[PDB]
Amino acid sequence: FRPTYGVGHQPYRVVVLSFELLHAPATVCGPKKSTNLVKNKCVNFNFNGLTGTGVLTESNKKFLPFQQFGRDIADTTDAVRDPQTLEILDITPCSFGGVSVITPGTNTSNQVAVLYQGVNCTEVNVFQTRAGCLIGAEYVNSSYECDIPIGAGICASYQTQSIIA
Amino acid sequence: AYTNSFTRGVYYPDKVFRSSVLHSTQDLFLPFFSNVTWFHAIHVDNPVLPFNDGVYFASTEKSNIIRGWIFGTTLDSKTQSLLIVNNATNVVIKVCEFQFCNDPFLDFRVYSSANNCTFEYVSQPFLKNLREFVFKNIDGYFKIYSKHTPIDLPQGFSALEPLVDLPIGINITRFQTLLALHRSYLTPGDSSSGWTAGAAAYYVGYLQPRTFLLKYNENGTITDAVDCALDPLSE
Amino acid sequence: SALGKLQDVVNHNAQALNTLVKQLSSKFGAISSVLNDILSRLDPPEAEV
Amino acid sequence: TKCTLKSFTVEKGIYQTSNFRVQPTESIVRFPNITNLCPFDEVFNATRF
């Protein structure tokens, strides 16, 4: 090898990689892919393989240094530690529930009020009740013999021109 | 000799936190009130002990007379045998098919044939003090649990914590122990004379598939356990 | 145990709900219980069955 | 409500028509952080072939 030599005789350095895959307790895997964490919002998370959905909140439980996951009764994953900062986070599924329609009758009027049962009005006039968030009806202090039962001691009826709870 | 093993050998099996709840798990545990072989650490070098399904090695010593272990299907170089050696500075774990002599060398730091090592690892050492160890190798991984407690085996309850989960997939079928001594000679073969050492002993127990009812406290630590198949009241 | 009946009603309802929630982990003969794995490690024609 | 009761005239009362469920607003993945890589760099840059 000397510099006057043409291309066909110029020393090419070559390196060949052979990946074996038989019985593989694979000890080499280096893909990065780690995005910044988001809290207090319904987010899909994948913590070191654990996939789920829910709202993340700062934890108050004492994880032992060798523990990585937390579960309540019936295998519900309640908490997880970050594989990056090792901070404990609480998982609670964000609010969901059934919705019901309050109607005074097609033949009286077409107005309608909607009752979201398992929710607070902050994450849906508007009114809050122990039975859920009620929309479309105004709360009055007068007590009457009630005819449309909503729940938790609250009822609704046609004012006569509005629906009152 | 023989001696019944009390409520010992329980370990955290799943590294999952649980608070103020009872949990039943089917895994390889040490049955309560079972007898375990008892040996002394004076001299001879050491007989081979099978690695049936998992070994519970407890040792009460105060002179660092026991310093490691060796596992594998044979002591010869015909297969990639395993090495585990502790030390005052670090642990040396190796799988290199080194053919061994008739007896494990007594630390004069090594006595084995050539090697074709495939895995090696090093880390901080695993160190009246009752040292407990549980060795398990089932799912292609070889796992170690341990705990060191102040103080015969005490009647007190205490669970072992997962120390290391190694990925080596060697087919382990037999196992031996490693001894040590200060200013001791080392040869491939020796008689029953041995060399002097401090008063010490080590126990051996065999794990079995059992159903255990574990009790977690408010901080996620095991405080009690029930052998589901010991007696009618436990059942 | 003066209130055995009311307590028994409460425990029956609670236990029924608990077992209904617990029965979600069973495979019922499928290769896995979580929907994500089933839809991940198999083609759609076999993932249907 | 008319469409669920399958009737153009709905009488006075409360009816459970459907359910709502807030969708996830973001998606996050948390993978490894890679520590102690491999010497391929050296392998190719050792200039000792």
Curated annotation (Swiss-Prot), chain B:
In the record, the effect of R131S is given as: In strain: Gamma/P.1
* Effect caused by changing N171Q: Increased resistance to neutralizing antibodies
Q: How the protein is affected by changing T60I? A: In strain: Iota/B.1.526, Mu/B.1.621, B.1.1.318, Omicron/BA.1
Q: Which residues are reported to be glycosylated?
A: N35, N87, N116, N171, N219
User: Reported effect of changing D152G?
Assistant: In strain: Beta/B.1.351
Please give the positions of the paired cysteines in each disulfide bond: C96-C117
Location of region: Putative superantigen: 217-235
| Residue ranges annotated for the BetaCoV S1-NTD domain, each copy included | 1-235
Ranges for region Disordered: 183-199
Q: What is the effect of changing D45A?
A: In strain: Beta/B.1.351
Relate the outcome reported for changing A159V.
In strain: 20A.EU1
| Result of altering G189V | In strain: Omicron/XBB.1.5, Omicron/EG.5.1
- Result of mutating R131K? Partial loss of biliverdin affinity
On assembly, the entry states: Binds to host ACE2. RBD also interacts with the N-linked glycan on 'Asn-90' of ACE2. Cleavage of S generates a polybasic C-terminal sequence on S1 that binds to host Neuropilin-1 (NRP1) and Neuropilin-2 (NRP2) receptors. Interacts with host integrin alpha-5/beta-1 (ITGA5:ITGB1) and with ACE2 in complex with integrin alpha-5/beta-1 (ITGA5:ITGB1). May interact via cytoplasmic c-terminus with M protein. May interact (via N-terminus) with host bilirubin and biliverdin, thereby preventing antibody binding to the SARS-CoV-2 spike NTD via an allosteric mechanism.
Describe its function: Attaches the virion to the cell membrane by interacting with host receptor, initiating the infection. The major receptor is host ACE2. When S2/S2' has been cleaved, binding to the receptor triggers direct fusion at the cell membrane. When S2/S2' has not been cleaved, binding to the receptor results in internalization of the virus by endocytosis using host TFRC and GRM2 and leading to fusion of the virion membrane with the host endosomal membrane. Alternatively, may use NRP1/NRP2 and integrin as entry receptors.
**Would you tell me the protein name for this molecule?**
Spike protein S1
Q: Which gene encodes it?
A: S
Q: Which residues of the full protein are shown?
A: 27 to 298 of 1273
From Swiss-Prot, chain D:
Spell out the residue ranges making up region: Disordered.
21-37
Q: What superkingdom does the record give?
A: Viruses
The impact of changing N33Q is: Reduced viral infectivity
Glycosylation sites per record: T25, S27, N33, N45
The record describes the protein's role as:
Attaches the virion to the cell membrane by interacting with host receptor, initiating the infection. The major receptor is host ACE2. When S2/S2' has been cleaved, binding to the receptor triggers direct fusion at the cell membrane. When S2/S2' has not been cleaved, binding to the receptor results in internalization of the virus by endocytosis using host TFRC and GRM2 and leading to fusion of the virion membrane with the host endosomal membrane. Alternatively, may use NRP1/NRP2 and integrin as entry receptors.
Q: Quaternary form? A: Binds to host ACE2. RBD also interacts with the N-linked glycan on 'Asn-90' of ACE2. Cleavage of S generates a polybasic C-terminal sequence on S1 that binds to host Neuropilin-1 (NRP1) and Neuropilin-2 (NRP2) receptors. Interacts with host integrin alpha-5/beta-1 (ITGA5:ITGB1) and with ACE2 in complex with integrin alpha-5/beta-1 (ITGA5:ITGB1). May interact via cytoplasmic c-terminus with M protein. May interact (via N-terminus) with host bilirubin and biliverdin, thereby preventing antibody binding to the SARS-CoV-2 spike NTD via an allosteric mechanism.
Put simply, this protein is called: Spike protein S1
Question: Which residues of the whole protein are included?
Answer: 299 to 347 of 1273
